[PDB]
Amino acid sequence: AAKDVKFGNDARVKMLRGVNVLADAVKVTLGPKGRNVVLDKSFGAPTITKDGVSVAREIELEDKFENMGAQMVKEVASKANDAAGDGTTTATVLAQAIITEGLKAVAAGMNPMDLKRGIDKAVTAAVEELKALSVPCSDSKAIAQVGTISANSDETVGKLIAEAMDKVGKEGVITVEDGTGLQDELDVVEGMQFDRGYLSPYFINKPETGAVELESPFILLADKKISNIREMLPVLEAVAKAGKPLLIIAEDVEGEALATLVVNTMRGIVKVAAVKAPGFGDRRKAMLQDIATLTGGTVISEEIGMELEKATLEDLGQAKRVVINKDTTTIIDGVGEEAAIQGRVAQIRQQIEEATSDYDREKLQERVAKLAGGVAVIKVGAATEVEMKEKKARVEAALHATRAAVEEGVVAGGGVALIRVASKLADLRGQNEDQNVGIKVALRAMEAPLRQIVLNCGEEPSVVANTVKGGDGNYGYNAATEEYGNMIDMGILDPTKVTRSALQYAASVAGLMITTECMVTDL
Amino acid sequence: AAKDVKFGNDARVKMLRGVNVLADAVKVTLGPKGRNVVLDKSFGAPTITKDGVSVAREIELEDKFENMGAQMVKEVASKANDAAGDGTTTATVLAQAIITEGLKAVAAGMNPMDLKRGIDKAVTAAVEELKALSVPCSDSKAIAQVGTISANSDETVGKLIAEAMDKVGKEGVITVEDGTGLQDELDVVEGMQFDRGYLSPYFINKPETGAVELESPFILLADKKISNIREMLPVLEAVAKAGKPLLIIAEDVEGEALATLVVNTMRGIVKVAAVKAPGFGDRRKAMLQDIATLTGGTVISEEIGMELEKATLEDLGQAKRVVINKDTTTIIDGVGEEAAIQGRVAQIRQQIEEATSDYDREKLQERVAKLAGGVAVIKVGAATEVEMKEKKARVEAALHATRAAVEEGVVAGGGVALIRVASKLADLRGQNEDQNVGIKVALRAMEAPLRQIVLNCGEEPSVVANTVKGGDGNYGYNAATEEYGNMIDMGILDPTKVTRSALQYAASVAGLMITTECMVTDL
Amino acid sequence: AAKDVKFGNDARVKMLRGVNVLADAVKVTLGPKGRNVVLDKSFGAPTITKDGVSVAREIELEDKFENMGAQMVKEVASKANDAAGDGTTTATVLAQAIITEGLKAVAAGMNPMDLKRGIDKAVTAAVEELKALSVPCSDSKAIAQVGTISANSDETVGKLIAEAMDKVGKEGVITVEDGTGLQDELDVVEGMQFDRGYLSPYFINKPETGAVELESPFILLADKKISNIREMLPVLEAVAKAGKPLLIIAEDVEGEALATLVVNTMRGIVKVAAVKAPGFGDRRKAMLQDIATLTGGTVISEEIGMELEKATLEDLGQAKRVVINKDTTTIIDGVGEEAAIQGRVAQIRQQIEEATSDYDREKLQERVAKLAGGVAVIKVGAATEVEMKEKKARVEAALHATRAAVEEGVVAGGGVALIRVASKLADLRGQNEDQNVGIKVALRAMEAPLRQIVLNCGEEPSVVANTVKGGDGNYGYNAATEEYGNMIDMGILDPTKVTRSALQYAASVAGLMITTECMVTDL
Amino acid sequence: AAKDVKFGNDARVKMLRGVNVLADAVKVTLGPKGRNVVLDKSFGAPTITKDGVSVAREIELEDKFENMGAQMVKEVASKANDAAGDGTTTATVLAQAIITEGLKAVAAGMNPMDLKRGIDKAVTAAVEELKALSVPCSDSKAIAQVGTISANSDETVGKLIAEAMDKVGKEGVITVEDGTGLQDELDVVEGMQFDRGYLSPYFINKPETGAVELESPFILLADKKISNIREMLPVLEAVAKAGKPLLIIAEDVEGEALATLVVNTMRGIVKVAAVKAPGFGDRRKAMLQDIATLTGGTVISEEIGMELEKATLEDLGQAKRVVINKDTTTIIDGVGEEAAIQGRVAQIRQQIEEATSDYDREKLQERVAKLAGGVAVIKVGAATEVEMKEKKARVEAALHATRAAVEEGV
Ligand SMILES: Nc1ncnc2c1ncn2[C@@H]1O[C@H](COP(=O)(O)OP(=O)(O)OP(=O)(O)O)[C@@H](O)[C@H]1O
Ligand SMILES: Nc1ncnc2c1ncn2[C@@H]1O[C@H](COP(=O)(O)OP(=O)(O)OP(=O)(O)O)[C@@H](O)[C@H]1O
Ligand SMILES: [Mg+2]
Ligand SMILES: [Mg+2]
């Protein structure tokens, strides 16, 4: 309908207020000092998740302007959240600080573009500093510590992550499932993961993550793309009879014919998924073979001349469950044959040795590795189902963070890195004063999140911040200890990536907010 | 329903007020001095685009009269915006100044027709002056500068435009795509562009521009027009199975049979597009052949006796993506065959030499050129996806402006041309006094936009304007420098066309507004 | 009564609103092209005026808080007119300027105390600059030039002033009275003047000028503090029998019974005015003697056992006329004994010769100066009573302008001196940035008067200000002729004292108001 | 009290509305075909009138701002009638016209100060043009023609005016009184007139015309400023004993105790009127002498040690009648001593001969003109008291129209 438009400060104020409200709840929650937040649910009794984000998610602003402004922060934060796996709150906190200052500058009537530029400039510098600052992740003990951080003092989660990580291998993928019982169960499972996208978001399953999980999926592998439904159809009919969800692997699943029917026709009355077959060329075929063996299903190729229509259900393999995400598709456990799987691995392994070339070796080795690695499953127990779900969610979050953290390496947590970088940053200047202030603002923003933790502590963040800044190297404040010590030595480290991601996003948001002269809303 | 009608000044005032509101937001934004504007979105967090227009777009007036009046300006401005590629704001600014004065004249009770005539007369004179004034665009360095202007101090965009422009060639078309990653990628791609319209706006794709982009379009080329669906249909069915969007090239696509089904029946459940085959006569056929080779598809002709029905999907070529606009249709990249494409070019090239006649040579050379030129693709990276989109939009705008600017040649920016012309204009007189005042009004209007920039500077526009006027030749004020220098030497130049376009449209709008005695609204 | 209390920005917006009503009403009258202001009167037809002091006197607001803001600025600004004989409207314009931008900065989070320190510094330096810019006015030629300028270019008024000042000293006491005919008269007479105003404003007599004239009054000298009428009734009765008015010069009159009756009761039956004796301590007694001998009366001192109960008419002194105002009492023609007066002057002259300290000598000769100085009475003659009365007003005005001019010289009028000194102070800085914006706030405020003046001229104030600032020395804009030039040569100047008082008082309230955190008023 | 403040165009529309009500009400009566206006009265039945001045007098608006607009135009326009004896309605009509279009231009963004300068110029030139267009009215034939025209074509009224003016000068003082019968009477009498009106409007007597008539009043001449009643009570008592009204000609009467009591208290017990002495400075004193000798009274001057406390009735002068208005006092029949009056006129006549400057001579002869001029009294006779009263009004009107005509033509 008609839209109400505001411009200038008036627009800004609304956004600012909205931002603060969202930020405030988040800020307190963030940090181990803060307590877990529960989100009220209209649907049922509130769900308790240890997410800064969740608070934000719940929070809606009645005021459209404020709400919209609030929304902006959240969306960006989530984006950071996804990539980093953590630091949703941090970005939010950072954004708020930046925005407020930026707004003030706007109040000043300095030209905001420069501020943004300065902020961007500062951010870039900070990022560089952070990268240098970052130090490689420590051993599993560190990993547990990393896990704990994601845990927010969930020791078990960290332990589970470490334990799972050790057995599977850090590289090896770990999957989380609801626990059978109170006691957690860690079982290694056979399976392979190949990075393949899901053809359409439509395919994307119920859960919020958007990864699709199929229960007892049926796997059809075709080297050939499926041009038309019709050939596929007779396969589908059998599948339908089984009623088990169908997962399709094709070199390409032709979108409209299959997908249009699948999505529109198949609500989830039937379940279907499609993924591109991993790899390309012979390797792709080889990969398919590896997959096929693991599944225990068979693959049909034109070259073979096997017909999809001819192929029965039996040809299709089955998986205990499959999870698909945009980046990757994995099969948690193909039923497979134990002997069959092993034999294939050996055969591939032999091939790897056989090939003189590195290239051949690499492909083969990669192929074996996927099968060999298998998948690890973690069960989270809980006193109650509700708890288990909550725990599970936390565990999952911890796992992505840990995995990210290890690869990236760890940097001092507590926003120590942020503060540390800022000091260096301060020296750096912007082209013009307006830029300069923006740069300073960014630096100020970085400092803030450290303070917030301190505030939760109840210690005066000023002193802590000052002290922290004074210390060279990794100098930081440990909330739990409430003692000064090396962050690394303490072993409380925030992932470089997460920190970097959050900062950049927040800066982006802040810059955007500052720029936005005008807001428009519906009446 | 019932309409509320106003007449006379009362109508005028409403329009005027509405105009001012829209104008005011735009005016401030316009100019590098101004800051980028963000539009609030109900849908989601606000989108930041560097568009004067966007502010206008967002702005709606609650008052119907005001709103309608506001609307009038916007629509015209956009029209100017499209043609010029830039200067949306300028037109708006110009219009507002003109309208207000005109309204005042109306208040005066001078007969407004004459004013309009004078304004038109003044405009014409101004245009002539501008054309003479304009000086050919400078080299790529200038181009970058031109790009920067579109950039609004986006150095990268200007660089990208220049870089893309250099490689492709100014004449060569450049296409923009979202960046794969943060770093921009510029890749030359094979492809040909032929200026063909889209048969129906219905075909027009989702995006606002209305250019239709198809992903992996399938190309069917027929020399023959497709009389009826039926022959086409079997082709379509295959296409549907692929599910890949279908692009159709026909000498004429018979509108109702194909299009009625396509538009109505094919929502975008399937995607189809139709374009007329480029050229006519043998040349058209030749062009088709060139296209066909590039696509890698084949063309079916009655003369050949190949049947559309007979023709399979294979006959149809594929394109990585196709973009269509009303003026032109382009294929970003036909898969083509590298050898095949090259061979054809050579063959055509040989033909060009072979033909004695210029005419034959020209056609052949044109044909080769399209294939030879290929298309250039620019990827815009961004820290965040949102940024990338914003950046991309800016880039696109810059590119049209730059392209337009180069051909037209550049004139001093800063509204220097406008002010300069006006002084000359002032001497010119109108038939009658009422006309005279209108002429003066137009001149006044031209001056204003210079002032606005100055105002953003905070320098008193009066002095600047006076100073600017005093200087002969290209004398202007550089906002960034805040120093007086030659506009050309400064290298900050606004395209002649954009300036001309904006002025004319604004004048048209202003004239229309002045004339409009009465407004009517719904109750 | 229950109060309504406001803090911070809430009290801020309130005061700003009250100040803007007062300032905007008063400033329309500023400059040669000042507009009129209509002040309603229940007494009959409205009054159309351009006297900014009259307008201010009528300003009272409904909102208790806003009214507090207005009454504050009115009280301080009035002190300027009292001190320099002019400056109130300029003081109001400046005050509004400093307060407007000051509070903006405060609301921007800047430190109120710092802001005030900066404002205060700029004013200190600026006053120094005005002192430097001042053109002296000492020689009789200068005195006359200033006089005629003030008397609207009346050579005769300038002559009168110069003649009077020459015949009684530049710092001598000069009065203006009605003429006895066509010719002007000037005669020094036995009189005196001391800085002591009326005890009650309710003593104001016919002179609308806020003064009190008493023809042939009886001077009552009592160094006692009269709080009760009882011991004074006999005197009052005797005075009443004489029908002559009375002037009570006592140590102090307390509003218990005396000042109570003298005002509340004597509203027509008698004409009684009361003032405090000059000085304090022993000097108070000595001075009363001087006044006593001068008026031929005797002082009633309890020390000598003098009883007011027995104070007969012979004890009371007398003078041809006495004029008392806010802070001054002037005894125009003492009926003292020439020889007695000469005797005292000699007696004190001797005391000076045998003085043992600078302080003694100074005060001693200040007393002889008063007695031996006399009063210069100007009798304004004319052809008609109307002319006589009008000229008399001009003489009174020119006299107060010239006296201010002899004291601190003269400076470029038209709001040019303030904008001049301000352009010099562009490099001035303070202990910190807040203090710096404080300095800028004051400098920008110094341009308000000229810009207002030019505004009433229908001209562009930012253009004229920009031009005047770019000039040097007493170069400015003559709003009368609307041409630039040398303000002093163009005869457009103000006594440096009024420009100074205006700025200082303006900065005073502006400072207090900017450092006010809470407002209390009745509900 | 808390105020309501308006600026620019807001104050503009307000004043324009108040002016339009006033002007539109008053202008309906303009011309020979002017319409009537009904003015309500609580006193009884409404008054139907065509007198635009009466209508204006009743105009007061509810909106404080609009009322300010109306009261402004009413105050200035009234000055026209006071000055020329007519012009108020025309002044209102013109004012409304100039203000209507003026404010339109102002609202159109034109400079108010410039607009006013232009208006002022056109008026300067136009007044010059009117002066050129003017047909003189000096000869007795002309005087009579204008007189009868003003008296609704009454040849007798024109004759009266012309006769009076001839017998006392065109700029001489002429009064109109009730006749003693059928025949008109005209007789020059010892009198004088000076430009000084009543101090308080509350002194208005029976004459609804905004004037005050006093039969056989006692003239009190005091060059002092009387602010308190104390030192005047004895005189007032004596005057009261005489039952005759009183005219106080002083330097100025201050509203502290004197003007206060003289008005607020003397609302029926006595008939007292007060006016300022003519001129200023030394001339003020001289003129008071002229008035003194003329009325046969003496001036109380503090300079001579004169005390109002001892001012007896013999000090007070007397006249057959005295008429005071907004800005004029006319002493119709001074009980002065013929020879004394002639003596003064001669004394001043001598002073003129030995004058040493134009200014002295001028003012000196202005004084002898007043004393030696006398007052021409017209007695309007008729067949019935009604006719007499109606004709008298016509004579008063025609007299004021003719005097204006002799001064600047027609
Ligand atoms: N004992 C500790 N001392 C210092 N800081 C700590 C300590 N333990 C954790 N932190 C810090 O607290 C922050 C992690 O908390 P949290 O995960 O709530 O923040 P977040 O990741 O931004 O919010 P969310 O997880 O909701 O996105 C990190 O900066 C982390 O280093
Ligand atoms: N440094 C500069 N000095 C002078 N003017 C400048 C400078 N850089 C750009 N400009 C001017 O600013 C204007 C371009 O800004 P902008 O693109 O916002 O205006 P617009 O094209 O009318 O608005 P929109 O792009 O929203 O349609 C041109 O007149 C351009 O010459
Ligand atoms: Mg976290
Ligand atoms: Mg542009």
Residue numbers in the entry:
A (entry chain G), B (entry chain A), C (entry chain H): 2 to 524
D (entry chain I): 2 to 411
Task: Quote the passages of the study that discuss this structure, keeping the authors' original sentences.
We used an ATPase mutant (D398A) with normal ATP binding but 3% of the wild-type steady-state ATPase activity. The separated classes produced six distinct 3D reconstructions of GroEL-ATP states, three with ATP bound in one ring and three with ATP in both rings, in addition to an unliganded (apo GroEL) population. ATP-bound rings from GroEL-ATP7 complexes are termed Rs (single), and those from GroEL-ATP14 Rd (double). For the Rs states, the fitted models reveal three distinct new conformations between the T state (apo GroEL) and the GroES-bound state (R-ES), termed Rs1, Rs2, and Rs-open. Very similar patterns are seen in the Rs and Rd series, but the Rs series is simpler and is sufficient to illustrate the major steps in the trajectory. The initial step after ATP binding is an en bloc, 35° sideways tilt of the intermediate and apical domains as a single rigid body (to the left in Figure 4, top panel, Rs1) about the equatorial-intermediate hinge. Pivoting of these domains about the equatorial-intermediate hinge closes helix M (green, containing the catalytic residue D398 in the native structure) over the ATP-binding pocket. The tilt breaks the salt bridge between intermediate and apical domains of adjacent subunits (R197-E386) in apo GroEL and replaces it by a new contact between K80 and E386 in the adjacent equatorial domain, as previously described (Ranson et al., 2001). In addition, the contact E255-K207 between adjacent apical domains of apo GroEL is broken and replaced by a contact between E255 at the end of helix I (orange) and K245 at the end of helix H (red) on the next subunit. However, our new data show that after ATP binding, adjacent apical domains are linked by intersubunit salt bridges between the ends of helices H and I, thus maintaining the continuous collar of binding sites facing the cavity, albeit with different orientations of the plane of the binding surface.
Currently best understood is the bacterial chaperonin GroEL, which assists the folding of nascent or stress-denatured polypeptides in steps of binding and encapsulation. The non-native polypeptide is first captured on a ring of hydrophobic sites lining cavities at the ends of the barrel-shaped complex. Then, the combined actions of ATP and the cochaperonin GroES trigger a dramatic series of concerted domain rotations that eject the polypeptide from the cavity wall and encapsulate it for folding in isolation, inside a hydrophilic chamber capped by GroES (Mayhew et al., 1996; Weissman et al., 1996; Xu et al., 1997). The process is initiated by concerted ATP binding to a GroEL ring, rapidly followed by initial contact with GroES, and concludes with additional rigid-body movements of the GroEL apical domain to form the GroES-domed chamber.
